[PDB]
């Protein structure tokens, strides 16, 4: 599946959110929303800001 790189640290602030660290390689689950992307961070799934991630194709 599509991978993204974490460009910044992100601490979750809401139920549906996940935390990530700068340099994390995440699996992209859904990128239909322009602002919020659903990813898998190691073992956890949830939203992070689309802007803090970079798609690796």
Look up the CATH number of the domain holding residue 48. Answer: 2.30.30.40
| Resolution in angstrom units | 1.8
Hey, which residues does 46 pair with through a beta bridge? 39
Domain containing residue 21: 1-57
| Phi, psi angle pair for 19, to nearest 5° | -100, 145
Hey, which residues does 25 pair with through a beta bridge? 5
Give the integer Cα–Cα distance in Å for 56 and 52.
13
Cβ(23)–Cβ(5) under 8 Å?
A: yes
Give the integer Cα–Cα distance in Å for 51 and 14.
17
Method: X-ray
Give the integer Cα–Cα distance in Å for 53 and 6.
5
SS3 state at 2: coil
Number of domains in the chain: 1
Cβ(39)–Cβ(25) under 8 Å?
A: no
């Amino acid at each position: 599946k599509e991978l993204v790189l974490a460009l910044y640290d992100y601490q979750e602030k809401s139920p549906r959110e996940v935390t990530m660290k700068k340099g994390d390689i995440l699996t992209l689950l859904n990128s239909t929303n322009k602002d919020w992307w659903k990813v898998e961070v190691n073992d956890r799934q949830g939203f992070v800001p689309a802007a803090y991630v970079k798609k690796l194709d």
